[PDB]
């Protein structure tokens, strides 16, 4: 069979805190001797609607930061801010911290969110970054400061720290260097995102692990050129796919037999036929949050 | 609403691989037990149709590899209990968590943890079918990955993976080593019964939905649990039991709709079809009412 899975959450949970500040309390992110957490932790509801926090920043103290991991105290020595994020110097190291590495995903790519509330790990699932930068999750009050991550060979990358839910249901978060991805920014206001697409490549993907899992259905005896597809493609609000992107379906073409541009032949078909009643991998649309990759380590290790 | 998965963390403390021979395999390490399938005392030539007491007889401490990570604990007693091993070892596991072993229904849904060579590569969630099949994603060396629920730090252990049935869904059993199913731990092609849809599920999806504000199918009318049932058969929908009834008194409460009114409205929409519910013409079967409290209203 062929599932949304995430990786394995342990190394991740043991990092996970609590920080509070005045009334606002939030998950942070504990790794040697730093906590990394949204910053509004230190704002209140009317600050919020513009918040200066340079300004709001210098007038707090180490002791106006209140972390715990589990029932145990943690003492803040230091503070700064990076960018959308506080890093609070606390005078404890975390042994449970993986080896570690921030990184910035691109859209397109996949990770593993934390649900977490009150500094206690609650959920897990994967999302994949929209090329609108907005993120499909499921958060609730309290979810800021979880955060999303891969892992490879026991280094955990982290990715994405929880911040924002917009008045469509989606996320926006940061990266952790405190940058936002998309054009959100941390205030108390309504913020829509620019109109999404459909990962194409990642379509592609899934359809190669379908023929994998022994579904074929949708294949057909026809081929396209790469412009002809990316033609239909753009049609339907679908990424144009790059010879890059051709290359990187190597490996999931090479297994099948089955030539890219025969697979863009079968999902331009799918498009302008539409799926009429029928089902690939158990779904009854085209999937795109799963990429090459999270297809190859799925069905072959 | 989305499937996700308990943090796996307290399960992944307890993973280690087993091995017989060249056979590898994953196992459940909790306090000085190490819990594994029996299949690995198996050669690639004696799964067939094996005498598991006989070829256990031929075994001893000395015949098992037990390893977190590369690092050997020692077997000091082993027995078997239905298709289980019970492999007791000289250390008890520091990471082990507070646990029970429950023996989970149809219709019940649980974190799998898939594993190879001891360690964990993957978590995500799965629904008991009434078939008594789970629709997994498991490859070559998954056999001993276990499915498990979180509730309050207390681990409920509920399945242990052995097979994958050639239609491509899986089997396995409970802690206690007994099959869910009338599935049996040998190399054969095994067939599952004719599935059925979850009642309990798609129920507790029309009460998420009500919690949406989606409530268009709901009706003036009422049904008895038997007339319910009945219908519900001619659809290839499970009866509901009155632990059914029961486990939705919560969802029944919030929305102020009783469980015999939203059979009432089920029953009308098998006899007469569907029109959206919570943005698809597909009832989802796959979240419990519990699933559905979880993400409604968050653990907070």
Not at 185 to 213: C, E, M, P, S
Not at 258 to 263: G, K, N, Q, R, T
Request: proline content about 4%; some cysteine.
């Amino acid at each position: 069979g062929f599932r949304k899975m995430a990786f394995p959450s342990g190394k991740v949970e043991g990092c996970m805190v609590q920080v509070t500040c005045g009334t606002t309390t939030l998950n942070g992110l504990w790794l040697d001797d730093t906590v990394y957490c949204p910053r509004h932790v230190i704002c209140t509801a009317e600050d919020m609607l513009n918040p200066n926090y340079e300004d709001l920043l210098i007038r707090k103290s180490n002791h106006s930061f209140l972390v715990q991991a589990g029932n145990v105290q943690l003492r803040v020595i230091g503070h700064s801010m990076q960018n959308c994020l506080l890093r609070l110097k606390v005078d404890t190291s975390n042994p449970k911290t993986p080896k570690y590495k921030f990184v910035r995903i691109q859209p397109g790519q996949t990770f593993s969110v934390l649900a977490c509330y009150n500094g206690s790990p609650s959920g897990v699932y994967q999302c994949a970054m929209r090329p609108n930068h907005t993120i499909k999750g499921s958060f609730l009050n309290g979810s800021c400061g979880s955060v999303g991550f891969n892992i490879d060979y026991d280094c955990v990358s982290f990715c994405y720290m929880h911040h924002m839910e917009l008045p469509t249901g989606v996320h926006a978060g940061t990266d952790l260097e405190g940058k936002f991805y998309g054009p959100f920014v941390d205030r108390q206001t309504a913020q829509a995102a620019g109109t999404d697409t459909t990962i194409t490549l990642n379509v592609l993907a899934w359809l190669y692990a379908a023929v994998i899992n022994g579904d074929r259905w949708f294949l057909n005896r026809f081929t396209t050129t790469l412009n002809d597809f990316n033609l239909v493609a753009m049609k339907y609000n679908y990424e144009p796919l790059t010879q890059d992107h051709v290359d990187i379906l190597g490996p999931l073409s090479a297994q099948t037999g089955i030539a890219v541009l025969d697979m863009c032949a079968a999902l331009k078909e799918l498009l302008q036929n539409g799926m009429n009643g029928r089902t690939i991998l158990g779904s009854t649309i085209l999937e795109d949050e799963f990429t090459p990759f999270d297809v190859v380590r799925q069905c072959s290790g």
